[model samples]
Target: TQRKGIILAGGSGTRLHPATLAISKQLLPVYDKPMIYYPLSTLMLAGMRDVLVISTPQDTPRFQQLLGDGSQWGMNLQYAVQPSPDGLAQAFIIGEQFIGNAPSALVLGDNIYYGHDFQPLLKAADAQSSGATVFAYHVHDPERYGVVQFNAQGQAVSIEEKPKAPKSNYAVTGLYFYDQQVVDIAKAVKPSARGELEITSVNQAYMQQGQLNVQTMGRGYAWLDTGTHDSLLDASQFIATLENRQGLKVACPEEIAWRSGWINASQLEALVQPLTKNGYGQYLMQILK
Candidate 1:
């Protein structure tokens, strides 16, 4: 029952312009850590180790250098080149060997999530034996996202991609959980008018089977999309504000691993040895103390 994971980091980041001109946006700083760290931490918190990161061919080597095999955090991280900016569902198809009959989770590189009780939500999504699952964040601007409409029973009744007139205020977040049938569904879907294999279509297939479920992201959660310069700064500021005010780092991969029992205290100690002088490393040491 291995739950595989994939981080889709393939975009050109045209929105970020000169800042992303020389580097992948995922490698850009989100407060104190790389943008990829947040999504990576999300998957790790969900208790996954066998993971793949898909990025543009030009930026794939850089990610490999930064994360390596993920052994430092008790993870088996791997990388693949997406070549082109394909749709989100294309991630499952790219990581087929890594997924192989197992359930898969996909998180976008630029999305940042901060929450105190997101663990139970992720646990429930992982416990699903069949169908696909996605998180719904209540946003005022539903027209900007793929909106999920719910029935009276709170079940997902309909999903529309960036509809002009949204049925609900709940926008689907970047995180997705899917059963083994996802690869086939992704393959079956034709590219949208945008010339991309949209992920919404994949979820639609699951909805047709009455197997798609939506998990509500309540007020206690913080989900940020760092696609634009303003949003990227907002995410960084959010992380900084929370960390400085609460004295706890958000999306710290090593911390998540230690808390999840993926690594021992000794491993954490050794991990911080090189950074004892830095505030980040000192904070990690304080946690184990």
Candidate 2:
């Protein structure tokens, strides 16, 4: 069975401050497209067609207005209100109904992943019918993220959230893939001292059961979390450089949908008409050529 996807877009952009006061950080542009498009495209590239986007009550309608049921991409995109910025693990509980006993992939709204081998990696994670999979990226400051420790045999031995002394430089990325049991696991998780149902707790539970698989994203892979001002600008610049140099858009949902056979030639053409005013439409036109 195909795994379902959940995008946790509910966080209060405290790090971004005044800029995100009125708008969701996910809706902000990371260059040419909204930040949400990156995570959504990750799910699309992972072969997930059924997706649930969880966000704040005030932002849910805005997302619906922007994504609109996802039919344009021939995907089922549903929206759920988070009510409050509870926690990342809360996304599973909120999207429990949408999951319906299926495996699920969760990607943070502000996270952007780009790599030459990303598609195959996503496919490998999706191919796993059991267990939980999380991507581990080498970050300069692992203490800033949930760190995963590995044993000699390359097995994940432990996971810690923001440790002062990280066991390794491999920090878990914002993307996660889990089996159906994740819903139950998330429901049983207690709130951390920070008073939120932490996603680290969920990963810890999977680790205890020896069911967690940590995939290290090696060299050439870029895992960006655009939650802060500097990082957001960095993400935009990274995307700008690639798109400008390659003459191909990154995280273009319409292009991915068409390439995945979810949308056809005419559907792609129709979607391009409205965007024709911009270079994005011209890129789509070139896809047809």
Candidate 3:
């Protein structure tokens, strides 16, 4: 089964305010690249070739210009307009045609997920091919997240959407993996009191059917939500620090494509041509060597 990917980039981004008041938050720089690059890289890393990006009507064209048909990375990329910040679940509905009957993976635009074992985790999820998958990270502020409760067998027994009194400290991360059922589940869901089709409800549907599985984020994993000025700065600083210290770029699409053999050295060279002046090209050049 083809597993499609969707990056939800539509939102008012009021949390980031004026910086986002004019542009999509995903378009903002996280470090050396746009915020959307991280999530896009995640999907690419997960081996998704055909993907859809949902953005606001005005910003959709900009994302189109920036990403095109994703051929640069040897992938098929499609775009759709969200019109409004309808909620995370709306992504499945908006991209239903693009997704067709394939399993889907959804990652939030402002969410950054990084880890050494991340590629394996994604590969495993793709292999499983059955249930839905979500990652749970232990956070100090459980009330700030949709907390998940597990049974003795390490199964997700319950999930509370931002409860006033959380049952556990594990917070649900923004990345989610689901089977084809998500399309109909997304359509059946009613908007919550906040006037959006909550993603929590979609996960709950899988949980009810005993098809929702949770992967705990142990040590060496990081999930950053850059929804505010402080967090955005923190994310940029974190990425800069990691790349500088390790001498490897994080969320580098060209590198990922080359490593996957989706593009050859000459294609990589073509991509590096314009980027060389900025030193990013030099960084990518090391890959060819």
Candidate 4:
């Protein structure tokens, strides 16, 4: 069976008004990448071979330019368009055919997930395929996202999206997993009074059916939402700081691609040549040995 991922990059960038007036938020630079790279790289890191990227029709072409057919990265990259600009839950519906009958992971395109142990934790989550698994990360602002509620027994009772009153500091990160049933569940969701399908409804359906799982990511993980101006800059600063301190790069999809056998050493070398001007290319060439 092929493990797969659906990257939802389809939101209008109204939050950042003028700057995003002409660009897809996914194409905005967060440190060294167009924000889309992070989620794409995360899915690639998790061993997903077949992936679908859902974006606005205009943005999809740019993604094709930057990512191409994905053969270079050892991934099958296909693009689907989400026309109505509905809310997040709609991605599951748009991505239904892309997911087919296989279990799939969904990562928001504006979400930048990076950590030393991210690969191991994420791969392990993919391995646990019985129930849907999501990650809980500690955030000072739980109300800013889908808040993960826990019972006294330490089981996640609910995930309230952008809740006004939060039950815990644990926020649901952009990454989500579900068995093949997500498509049907997503289809069954009624649109919120605000006139869009909400992802919270999809997760709640799973929770009610006793098929939801949550794992806390603790302090070691870094999950940044680059949806706004400040956060976008923060994400870039975070990556630059991390690389300067650790002497290693984050979101180097090429390196991860090579390591995952999506590309060979020689291919890695070829890709590195272009990056040499920025000095990232040489790192790829040196580490490839």
lDDT digits (tens) for residues 253-282 of candidate 4:
898888888889888888887788875677
Per-residue lDDT of model 1, residues 1-289, tens digit only: 3799999987755888899897788999988788889999889878888889998889999999999999999889999988788677788788888889889999888778878888788888899888888899989889998899977654678999889999999999999999889988998989988889889999899989888899899789999878788988888899989998999888898898899888899999999998888778989989999
**Residue 162 miss distance in model 1 (angstroms):** 1.7
Model 1 ranges with Cα > 4 A deviation:
none
lDDT of 3 by residue, 231-263 (tens): 889999999999889988889999999998889
Q: Which of 1 and 4 is ahead in TM-score? A: 1
Instruction: Identify the leading candidate in terms of lDDT.
Output: 2
The TM-score that candidate 1 achieves is: 0.96
What candidate 2 gets wrong by more than 4 Å, as runs, is 152-154
CA displacement after TM-score superposition, residue 279 of candidate 3 (Å): 3.3
TM per candidate comes to: 0.96, 0.96, 0.96, 0.94
lDDT of 2 by residue, 84-177 (tens): 7778899999999999999999998878999888889999889987889989999888999889998765568988888999999999889999
Candidate 1 lDDT trough over 10 residues, lowest sum? 149-158
Candidate 4 collision pairs: none
Please give the CA lDDT of all the candidate structures.
0.88, 0.89, 0.87, 0.82
Position 179, candidate 2: lDDT: 92
